[PDB]
């Protein structure tokens, strides 16, 4: 079959609209011709319109270049998720460019476009081929564009000579439709279709925000393609059946803006590390200075098993989580799927094989303060033993160990946060609290009852509350039932505890009940995403509130408080308020899909390195340390009464 | 541009080879024509050869049907992983069929093939289009075929009326190349390329074996496509770069055989469940009968804290693993990626949202036997307390709790086994052993030393042995160093323990050292994949070995053993041998890639439901139960000596 393409190949012109009709006995061929100069990249874009009546007889389009062939049909057809189909009547595509070097010299390029159909009567089509003026992207310069499920887009970026790492930030003013942003290398072909985009490069699903960090050394040639693909449905991104506007003919157009910004320098790393270390070594320095001053001025003028048990439990609880997080990080590094970890992508600063180094270095406070508390408790125990030759020193040892373990477990969790890791850190605290409660109750012994066995019943209630939360997740009225039950249990347990230990008593009981009701109302306002964390927070706040009555009662002229006690109380209150402010700034969440979580990301404020969550870590560590110090040294004035004062 | 395809469209014939030459001013068009009858499926396959000299100027091939257009180029080009390129000079493709219904009636089908090129002089090509005689697959009938990286294959299967679930088994006689097997629905297009195969259906990577289970209710129309795609490199499947053969003329041909077999019926489920329950309720029945007989015949003629602590630790260790495994199972169900869990796919029988129901139901023995042991220990404790108004009853309570928790954790791990889960079950036993050892040493008190503090040093050594194993994985000489160090530590610890508690003493010490050296030699033969499990096994065998000397020494006429002791010991030896046989049959492994693990799968033997691993679970549970019973009731003759006999 001898056929000459040039016989009917109408030499066509760019930026010109060609209308036509084709059927079984007709085929249309257009020949486009251009030249590529050195040190310049030219991209060609093809556009085809066809009406909708061509359903059983679409129009087939073929594009031929020297080393590639591309093809498709109009109208494009998409399959839904529940047996639904969509059809699009406008298709566009960018042909993979081929740069020309100075050594190569200017290159002549030829392109062929063939339009055909098997319609019995005739199919109408419109065609338009153009060049792309804005194809290469610049640093720090925002660029706007529009994409469609049948008109994917992609652009080229070249690494500047000096820059070593960059961040791509993509922003839209509305979700629905939700799209995919991908980064790939220069070699053709470019995968820009729904079924092959997630195959080669690094990709993120997005609705309003996206941010990708890239390093130069991973890209031969120091350049890359950025591809944007829209999806036919919003199911994957937390959406229901695709939203259709009144105007829309089917089309889901998405307006996007993209920026590329250079990343920070290592000097920031050094400054942040030094600041983090010193801000907490200041505590050790101040304690040493105070001790030295006291020695210069004032001086001149049984639990071992209960410690080693905790050590063993901590170590053999910590190891497996470390291994699991290591596996998660390795998988995320290798596969390139950035929808596994719920980072705050706008302030995730990598180091080595670590994706978010700041989120882990922000946990030094827990470890250091726990170690300092353990040192203080050990010093007090040694002094007491020496003086004898102060009863629950094992409790304070457990407190310090729990603080250190919480720091370590949070550091492990932040390696790759998702909907599988919070439970470990949540549950270790429950285990420690249960062990401490059992030890305290056994040591105190029943004697009279003792009390009314309220603590064990409360701990059980917590047990099956957590079990139910694991079983039913936001299930109809079970959510409300469990919420109300837990709040009522907390209220009545607090009432019993206060009563078992006089108008002041009634006043305090009423205040506690009112505070519990306020907690219940706050929980009613915002639904609690996680039951265990909610219960832990309620328990902690109730503990501080009970300590509030204890201190107030002790301050009824019956006894006195030394400067260290009330200094610690004021510090604890101020730090608790400060940390509670940051506790409510959520930059991510595993409750929803990765795109919904990414919608909440934020840039970080302190020294260009730390976001809200790091500040929360610091403040929580400090507040817990000062609360523990208040608990330990509350009773010192009573030491005035000698002959075996209160233990 | 008016072009008439029929003017040069040479009406071509099937099963005929057409040779041709094309260049810039020439294009070849062939028209194929056929008819499709109702209740019959016809598939067309296209073949193109082109010599390798066409590197800069390949031959472009386009295939046009009524509602689809397909295109490609020859020679096909593949990009390697380390900047390597491959080219294939023979390409074949199957065109998506369109079934004809009786209501629709026979339909005439037309097809167009266009061959073009831009070579300045000319490019040679050979073309051949055929029908597929063997396209539909039959039940229980094996089918052989061959595939290539540039010649993917796929076939159609229709669900028989009676069958409700099927299994696809694919077998090859040699790995390298490694391929992907996918199952998709009827609706076209069919994704059979390297970059879009893993997008729609359910897929598995394979080298020698593959097995996929499917249920009818998930497929509208009760039919599906099975697709086989070969890969250009073996990196993903544990191999190196493309291994070139004498024939490789680049081509990596893979011969495959495929079978489709119906799945088992629910009667097997019922039988297996009933057998599993009754085989272990027999123990309860026998114990009850023996107790009743003894009562009829013979009769006629402090730890609470140590128990509740263990309960709390167990519960708050177990919960997070349950949540994690639930998440894993949900992800595997949704995504369809069957390379996440290392099941034994040849005997994985689903139920509900459970992929391998048998592997979990095979863990009833641990739970039931642990509960029975706890009941026995509680009965003995109650009897002793009543008689007083037997010193380490807390140890036996911990033993029973550990057995039950091991059963539960194994059940949790088998939901989705991979390289992230063994650590939890391995570490819980370490924690329990450490707690028990510490409590025993504290209760025994130092008195004289006590002993030489060897146990604590050994436990510490285990600590950093596990830490090093986590740090260095098969790292040069570190593997051998750690292996030898652990073996020497075990040997010298056993020597010290035996010496601290007379030629029999030296005889036993020499025997123990020889056994430890035998263990070291066995470890030398086969490299240990996991350090923690290896150490746990060594410790367990050393414990049984020590119990062996203890019983033998007691049997030197110094004391006597009642029938229950020696019956239990014989049962323990028999069951240990039986279970140790099955322990060495590994049907899967997470050390290598999923394909390598799948190479080891096996069908299951007992009642068509249980493989080797289930038998191992049963036997290990029984052996551990009988060993614990031997330990508890070893010292009963010493009861003859009254006035506070040995506790
Ligand atoms: C009973 C004897 C002593 C037991 C000591 C161990 C148990 C008490 C808690 C110890 C400290 C663990 C950290 C607590 C809370 C936070 O870190 C986390 C937030 O990630 N959970 C949260 O829920 C956030 C904190 C909520 C704060 C509420 C308002 C103060
Ligand atoms: C010290 C006082 C009593 C402490 C009681 C708790 C600690 C001892 C072990 C308790 C039973 C746990 C089960 C042990 C082993 C096996 O289940 C697993 C196999 O998956 N590990 C394996 O390594 C396989 C078993 C290896 C067997 C070696 C040959 C007998
Ligand atoms: C639709 O197909 C019909 C026949 O299959 C075409 O009819 C002839 O097409 C040739 C090719 O252009 C013309 O030279 C003849 O003049 C046509 N016949 C008549 C009676 O007009 C028809 O041209 C096709 N449609 C279009 C738009 O070309
Ligand atoms: C294809 O259809 C689209 C939409 O119907 C056309 O887009 C219009 O283009 C004109 C300029 O010629 C604009 O003034 C309109 O606002 C556009 N409509 C939109 C964006 O909805 C397009 O011109 C048609 N032709 C081709 C070759 O694509
Ligand atoms: C390769 O291209 C050349 C020119 O571009 C072709 O030369 C002419 O091709 C036409 C097409 O059939 C013939 O009618 C002429 O007779 C050819 N010229 C001569 C001098 O023979 C050439 O045919 C192309 N290659 C092939 C195999 O057709
Ligand atoms: C393309 O090349 C292949 C291999 O070079 C050809 O396959 C041969 O086919 C003949 C039958 O015509 C067999 O006798 C040979 O054994 C095959 N060689 C193999 C399998 O290596 C094929 O015929 C060529 N032609 C086409 C159209 O594919
Ligand atoms: C190759 C480039 C990125 C190197 C730039 C220097 C960076 C990576 C170095 C400079 C100082 C270093 C820190 C110095 C001290 C500490 C405290 C220690 O407890 C953990 C490591 C940590 C936090 C180091 C992390 C890495 C660090 C921040
Ligand atoms: C035996 C008992 C009384 C010991 C009590 C612990 C004492 C030494 C602790 C409790 C609270 C501590 C202080 C808490 C906070 C700060 C602020 C810091 O910028 C300097 C150190 C300084 C001022 C600490 C010094 C040591 C301190 C006073
Ligand atoms: C009590 C004190 C000493 C505990 C200190 C624990 C610190 C050193 C541990 C806890 C969790 C650890 C991280 C866990 C996982 C990974 C991922 C791996 O790919 C690189 C190392 C990295 C990032 C670890 C670095 C060290 C780490 C932060
Ligand atoms: C003692 C402790 C460890 C026991 C814990 C048992 C819990 C975790 C078990 C018991 C029954 C289980 C449920 C049984 C059935 C279903 C329905 C299924 O569609 C989803 C899983 C779900 C909801 C299971 C989740 C886990 C579950 C709630
Ligand atoms: C939301 C889930 C996932 C985790 C967090 C739950 C817990 C920790 C939250 C939810 C309800 C919260 C409390 C609601 C109301 C009050 C009263 C206010 O005057 C101080 C803060 C305080 C005391 C909050 C502290 C934090 C809290 C206890
Ligand atoms: C230990 C506690 C009770 C001491 C007092 C803490 C007080 C001051 C805390 C608890 C709840 C906190 C508020 C919680 C939420 C908001 C809304 C936010 O848009 C601004 C901060 C603001 C307004 C916080 C300010 C500080 C706050 C009022
Ligand atoms: C809808 C089809 C698949 C139903 C077929 C019946 C199957 C699913 C039924 C029949 C008997 C059932 C078993 C009966 C008793 C037990 C013991 C219990 O401790 C766990 C559940 C378990 C193991 C059941 C699992 C489900 C089971 C095996
Ligand atoms: C108070 C002390 C001495 C009680 C010791 C426990 C006794 C009752 C236990 C120890 C070993 C047990 C036996 C172990 C195995 C079997 C085989 C089974 O097919 C029937 C029950 C039978 C025969 C058990 C009966 C109960 C048994 C004899
Ligand atoms: C001490 C005894 C009572 C403990 C019994 C534990 C049993 C009931 C628990 C332990 C682990 C659990 C499984 C863990 C995870 C899943 C996956 C989920 O999608 C369906 C339920 C299923 C398959 C659970 C079924 C119930 C289960 C097997
Ligand atoms: C809410 C949704 C978006 C959360 C998504 C979490 C899913 C995708 C995560 C959670 C656990 C992850 C798996 C954890 C471990 C393995 C085993 C490894 O050999 C390959 C990766 C693989 C298989 C991971 C793939 C991604 C994974 C399945
Ligand atoms: C007290 C216990 C919990 C401390 C455990 C610390 C362990 C887990 C930490 C300390 C130092 C860490 C290593 C530091 C550096 C590297 C090199 C990197 O390429 C892979 C991770 C690896 C190999 C880390 C693995 C985890 C590690 C070994
Ligand atoms: C291999 C890793 C992953 C887990 C298994 C390691 C442990 C449990 C293995 C490795 C070495 C093994 C031992 C090697 C040699 C002997 C001596 C033989 O007469 C009885 C079995 C016995 C006593 C084996 C028992 C199981 C064992 C202790
Ligand atoms: C508690 C122990 C020491 C009691 C004695 C157990 C003996 C009989 C066990 C330990 C190691 C076992 C062997 C381990 C490996 C093999 C190779 C396999 O192809 C056939 C079974 C065979 C040959 C096993 C037979 C049983 C065996 C010899
Ligand atoms: C409780 C957490 C306390 C965190 C203390 C400081 C954390 C240090 C973390 C690791 C630093 C080194 C490992 C990071 C990547 C190593 C690769 C490399 O440095 O080349
Ligand atoms: C230690 C493990 C002991 C195992 C005991 C028996 C295991 C029973 C497991 C669950 C049975 C029901 C849950 C399985 C899928 C539920 C969905 C359904 O049945 O419809
Ligand atoms: C493309 O344009 C150049 C510019 O004149 C011309 O030399 C060349 O012949 C054209 N290509 C074809 C195929 O005509
Ligand atoms: C190629 O040569 C031209 C000729 O001056 C030069 O301007 C250009 O910089 C060269 N290309 C590169 C990458 O240096
Ligand atoms: C295809 O073959 C049938 C069989 O006779 C014929 O009627 C029909 O016209 C053919 N199609 C074309 C396009 O020639
Ligand atoms: C279609 O009709 C023919 C005519 O007898 C019949 O044989 C065939 O079974 C029908 N198809 C189906 C799916 O029943
Ligand atoms: Ca590419
Ligand atoms: Ca399909
Ligand atoms: Zn955090
Ligand atoms: Zn197992």
From Swiss-Prot, chains A, B:
Key words, A-Z: Glycoprotein, Membrane, RNA-binding, Signal, Transmembrane, Transmembrane helix
TM ranges: 273-293, 305-325, 357-377, 393-413, 424-441, 452-472, 478-498, 506-526, 533-553, 564-584, 614-634
Top-level lineage group: Eukaryota
Residues bearing glycans: 23, 33, 49, 102, 248, 333, 418, 586
Extracellular side: 1-272, 326-356, 414-423, 473-477, 527-532, 585-613
Protein name per its UniProtKB record: SID1 transmembrane family member 1
Organism: Homo sapiens (Human)
InterPro entries (UniProt xref): SID1_TM_fam
One GO-annotated biological process of the protein: RNA transport
Family recorded in the similarity comment: Belongs to the SID1 family.
């Amino acid at each position: 079959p001898r056929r000459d393409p040039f016989d009917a190949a109408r030499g066509a012109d760019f930026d010109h609209v060609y209308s036509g009709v084709v059927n079984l006995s007709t085929e249309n061929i257009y020949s486009f011709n251009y030249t590529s100069q050195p040190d310049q990249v030219t991209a060609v874009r093809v556009y085809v319109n066809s009406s909708s009546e061509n359903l059983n007889y679409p129009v087939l389009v073929v594009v031929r270049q020297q080393k590639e062939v591309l093809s498709w049909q109009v109208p494009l057809l998409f399959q839904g998720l529940y047996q639904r189909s969509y059809n699009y009547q406008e298709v566009s595509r960018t042909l993979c460019p081929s740069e020309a070097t100075n050594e190569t010299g200017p290159l002549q390029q030829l392109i062929f476009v063939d339009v055909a159909s098997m319609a019995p009567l005739g199919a109408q089509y419109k065609l338009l081929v153009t060049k792309l003026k804005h194809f290469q992207l610049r640093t720090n310069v925002a660029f706007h564009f529009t994409a469609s499920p049948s008109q994917p887009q992609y652009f080229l970026y070249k690494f500047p000579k000096d820059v070593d790492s960059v961040i791509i930030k993509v922003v839209s003013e509305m979700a629905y439709p939700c799209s995919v942003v991908s980064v790939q290398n220069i070699m053709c072909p470019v995968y820009d279709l729904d079924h092959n985009v997630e195959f080669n490069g690094v990709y993120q699903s997005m609705t309003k925000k996206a941010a990708i960090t890239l390093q130069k050394k991973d890209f031969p040639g120091e350049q890359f393609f950025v591809v944007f693909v829209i999806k036919p449905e919003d199911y994957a991104c937390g959406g229901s059946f695709f939203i259709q506007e009144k105007e829309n003919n089917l089309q889901r157009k998405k307006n996007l803006e993209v920026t590329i910004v250079p990343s920070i320098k290592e000097s920031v790393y050094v400054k942040s590390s030094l600041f983090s270390v010193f801000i907490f070594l200041s505590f050790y320095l101040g304690c040493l200075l105070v001790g030295f001053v006291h020695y210069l001025r004032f001086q001149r003028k049984k639990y071992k098993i209960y410690f080693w048990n905790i050590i063993t439990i901590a170590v053999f609880y910590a190891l497996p989580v470390i291994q699991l997080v290591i596996t998660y990080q390795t998988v995320v590094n290798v596969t390139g799927n950035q929808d596994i970890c719920y980072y705050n992508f706008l302030c995730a600063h990598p180091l080595g094989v670590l994706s978010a180094f700041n989120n882990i270095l922000s946990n030094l406070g827990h470890v250091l303060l726990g170690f300092l508390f353990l040192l203080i408790v050990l010093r007090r125990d040694i002094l007491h033993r020496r003086a004898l030759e102060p009863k629950h020193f094992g409790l304070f040892y457990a407190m310090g160990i729990a603080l250190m373990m919480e720091g370590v477990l949070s550091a492990c969790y932040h390696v790759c946060p998702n909907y599988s890791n919070f439970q470990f850190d949540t549950s270790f605290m429950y285990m420690i609290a249960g062990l401490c409660m059992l030890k305290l109750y056994q040591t105190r012994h029943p004697d009279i009852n003792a009390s009314a066995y309220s603590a064990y019943a409360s701990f059980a209630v917590v047990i099956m509350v957590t079990v139910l939360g694991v079983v039913f997740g936001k299930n109809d009225v079970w959510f409300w039932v469990i919420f109300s039950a837990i709040h009522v249990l907390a209220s009545l347990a607090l009432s019993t505890q206060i009563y078992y230990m006089y108008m002041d008593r009634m006043v305090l009981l009423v205040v506690g009940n009112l505070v519990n009701w306020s907690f219940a109302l706050f929980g009613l306002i915002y639904r609690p995403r996680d039951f265990a964390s909610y219960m832990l927070g309620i328990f902690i706040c109730n503990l501080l509130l009970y300590l509030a009555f204890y201190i107030i009662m002790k301050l009824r002229s019956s006894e006195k408080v030394l400067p260290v006690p009330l200094f610690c109380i004021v510090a604890t209150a101020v730090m608790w308020a400060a940390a509670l402010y940051f506790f409510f700034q959520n930059l991510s969440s595993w409750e929803g899909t990765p795109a919904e979580s990414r919608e909440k990301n934020r840039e970080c404020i302190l020294l260009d390195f730390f976001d809200d969550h790091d500040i929360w870590h610091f403040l929580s560590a400090t507040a817990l340390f000062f609360s523990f110090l208040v608990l330990l040294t509350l009773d010192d004035d009573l030491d005035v009464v000698r002959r075996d004062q209160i233990p």
